Design a binder for these strands. Sequence first.
RNA 1: GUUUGUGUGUUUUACCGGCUUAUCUGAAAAGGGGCAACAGAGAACCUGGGAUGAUAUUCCAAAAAGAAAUUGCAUGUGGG
RNA 2: UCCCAACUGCAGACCGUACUCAUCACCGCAUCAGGUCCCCAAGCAUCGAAUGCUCUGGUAACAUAGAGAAAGGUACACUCAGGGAAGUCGGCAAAAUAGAUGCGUAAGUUCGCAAGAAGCAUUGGCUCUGAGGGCAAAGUGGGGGUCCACAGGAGGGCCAGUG
RNA 3: UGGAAAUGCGAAACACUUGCCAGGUGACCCAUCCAUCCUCCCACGGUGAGCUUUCUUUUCACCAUAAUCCACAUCUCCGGCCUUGCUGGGGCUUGGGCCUCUCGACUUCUCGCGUUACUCGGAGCGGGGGCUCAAGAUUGAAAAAUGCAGCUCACCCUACGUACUGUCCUUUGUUGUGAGUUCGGCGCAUUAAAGCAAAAACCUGGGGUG
Lengths: 54, 81, 103, 62, 113, 91, 52, 50
Amino acid sequence: RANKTEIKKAIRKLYQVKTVKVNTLIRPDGLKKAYIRLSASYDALDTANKMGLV
Amino acid sequence: PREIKNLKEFLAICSRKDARCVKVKHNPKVTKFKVRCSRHLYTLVMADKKKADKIERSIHPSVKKITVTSRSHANKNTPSK
Amino acid sequence: KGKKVFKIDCSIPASDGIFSDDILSNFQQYFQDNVKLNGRKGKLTSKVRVNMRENTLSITTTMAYRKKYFKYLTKKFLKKKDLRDWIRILAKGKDTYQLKYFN
Amino acid sequence: YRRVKELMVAPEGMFTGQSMLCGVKAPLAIGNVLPLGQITEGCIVCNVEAKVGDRGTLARAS
Amino acid sequence: SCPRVQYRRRMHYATRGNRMRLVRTPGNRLVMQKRGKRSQGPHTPWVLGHKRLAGTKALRHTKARLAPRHQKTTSRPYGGVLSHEQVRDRIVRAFLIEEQRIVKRALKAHAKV
Amino acid sequence: AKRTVKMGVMGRYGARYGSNPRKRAKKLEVSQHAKHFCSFCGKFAFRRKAVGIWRCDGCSKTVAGGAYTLSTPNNTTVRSTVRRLRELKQS
Amino acid sequence: LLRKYREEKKIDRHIYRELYMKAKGNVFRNKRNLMEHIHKVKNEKKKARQLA
Amino acid sequence: GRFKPLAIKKKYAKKLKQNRPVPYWIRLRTGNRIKWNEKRRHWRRTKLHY
RNA sequence: GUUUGUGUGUUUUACCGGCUUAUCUGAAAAGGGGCAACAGAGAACCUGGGAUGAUAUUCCAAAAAGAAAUUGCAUGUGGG
RNA sequence: UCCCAACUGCAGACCGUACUCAUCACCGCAUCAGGUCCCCAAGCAUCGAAUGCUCUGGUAACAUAGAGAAAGGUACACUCAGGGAAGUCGGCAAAAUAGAUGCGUAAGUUCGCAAGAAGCAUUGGCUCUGAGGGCAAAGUGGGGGUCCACAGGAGGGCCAGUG
RNA sequence: UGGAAAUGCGAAACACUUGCCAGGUGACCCAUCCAUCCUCCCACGGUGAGCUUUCUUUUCACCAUAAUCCACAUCUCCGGCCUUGCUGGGGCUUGGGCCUCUCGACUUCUCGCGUUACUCGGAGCGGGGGCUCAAGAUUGAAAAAUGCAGCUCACCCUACGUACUGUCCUUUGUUGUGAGUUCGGCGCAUUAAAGCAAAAACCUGGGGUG
């Protein structure tokens, strides 16, 4: 249900970051998938393993 | 890209406040000085090596410029092997 | 002076004397010869001119011309003299067409 | 500018939009609008009303 | 086929408002692009139209928002939408008549006294 | 290049649609299409559009005056009639 | 042909127009003829001149 | 057609998830009368229609 | 001192100009309700991509993808 | 008056998006010769989205098949001698019709047609020819090349040269 | 706020109102050929690939996007200082100015006609706007794109490098647009609205009340 905006607010605050851009869609998979470019101030892989993502 | 046409005018641009980037292109004849600014890439088209150099010299330290350059290798990769 | 010219680097096979124990001579004679004729049987033509050096053949002409003819001339030719071997031609300069060994 | 319009139902060929000033204080140009009574007998009018406040029911054909 | 030739928007049709126009690409291909809306606009005034303007610009409806006033500026009143002759006319016509109207009053003015 | 002996436009219908009609029709073709006088601008160029809808080429004036030819006798007559009568009416 | 001639003076205007219409009701029946025609006619004017 | 509203988007989604083998782990339990994934939708037979 | 030129004062006031509280004035009918176009009417992107397994005029960011276009809104400076 | 421009900084919702779109994804109950709107459309012959082969593309189609050369069939298969509708309810059938060109064309007719009326004639290949257009400078002479013109070039770059 | 004018401009600021704007501002059929753009084929050259054995010029390939300017020189004046000024395409529209066509004529056309003293035509000027271009510039070539090839650790990797080349031009045959309801059709006459420009308006700024 999320509109883009909201997501944007949330993550930036939640993850101590800023994102250069988001492409989103919901597949009928039923989920919205957010393609987010994290800014140069951040690295999505790195950041991944901050989450501890593999 | 908007093209810029007199040297002075250009100098004002190079110091535009914003005027992010410049860049140097050489081709036969010539060398384009392409400036990366807002709304456009304001660009002044320098034939002449002599003057070219001196104006090239003039570059305030702070100048961001790359020259137009060759095969970088685009850098895509497929993630096996 | 006004002309069109191409230089035929025949270097590698000439060097091995492939034109029946030669240095390029035999090929020079052959090359000047196959060009189309008429006049009825025993009449000959005179508008194209050929020089061979130590290691080149140069082909010069006042008249402008198809690059097309050479590509046949050699392809149909090697196949004609049984000189096909391992050579392949490429355009080296926009005025020199080069023959090469590879591998 | 600022006026009152002047085009509607079509009778003969004045060319349009014209300044007809009307009621009996119409003059009597063709098409001009005068009361029929105050139009003189034998005159040829067109689109007379009938109901009155109908602007031409009768002879509303070509 | 031998071209082709594909459709760069979904509504595939020809359509009045729709046009496309062909280009050779940098990838060197032939290609459609959309070719926009016609010159509908800046006609004259007068009588079912139907002629056009001068100086000031002739375009069509999406364009005007854009269209600059100083390109949309050769002028005389009522005729920023006009080119000379019709305007000349309308001047002239008032002027004279309005003399004769005054004259008419004036004619009658002596008859009274 | 050839222009028929006697029927003008009717060549379109060939034989179809009978002579008497062809008569009836012929008459109106001549009236309606013809180029006919302008009033003020005085030349003939008043051409029918639609259904007797006549603008003057060349003085760009449109006259409503109906049917196949513009302003019937009756109308004209009428026009006189009014001329007269109104005139008298003042006179 | 006519026009150029006209501007050349080769044609005079009256004649120009005439040929125009004449052309239009063609009796020029090939180019060759016409041009010829024109010389000849010009002879008639010259004759006319000489005569005069 | 090309476009097809969110509701519509929902109907397939909901269905798809049902259109596949019943969760097997379930099947294994005590007293599992369980024949199969009964109600599974399909397409070269069963267009959803409309 | 003059007269003039220049600059300044949170001067004072008169006067403008603005802007908002604020107060009065102040619109009429096939239109007093609102829908109805996945082709009408019909408002901003182009090409390229050692580019995906399967999507892209959407994926390619700063420099080599780039170059665009528009909106909104800021900001300073500029025109002022 | 400051926003009657400028530039610049800073941010962009929503909702669609795969793929199919048909001789299998649509729709004929059905993996159906039926149907089902839209864009695109080469080369060659030629009248030419024709017919035809073809490029480009795509097919390599698939549509159980093989094995076979008999009867019967079916086949958008033929052929038939002589003969020429006797046949037959009936010329159904099938067959005869042709392009073009030139030549030529009866009645009748509402004048318009009827008309490819009818009917003739011609039609390869080769090898010359003809006719049929566009595009320049009216137009010219004399004198100079025992050089007459300049900004352009080459070669003279082992001389103790110069830049 | 320029020029007799056609018609001008960084901004000549001026928004409500208009029984306001026959205001293509949306808006309109087909229709016609014709004209040409577009695209497109042919073919010349010319390149590059590929072909091609008794014979040949064979085959293919040979490119450029939106997006934006239009300042080069003529001429000014060829650059002393270049200063009037910035003059300067084609080829359809109209207009404008001068002269004023008449013994009639011109006149433009493929087309049906037309025009002219209701001002032709002719010249010169102004502008309209398909188009095309113009120093074509930007864009833009630059790993552009394309094709090669030479080498390369290595070349059977790799990274797919690295390095190199070449990568072009006249020229024939299709179609947007030419704006109308633009050729005919026409007892037929070819949606509408939101949607826009403009005007009129003209109240502000060029003012000391009292």
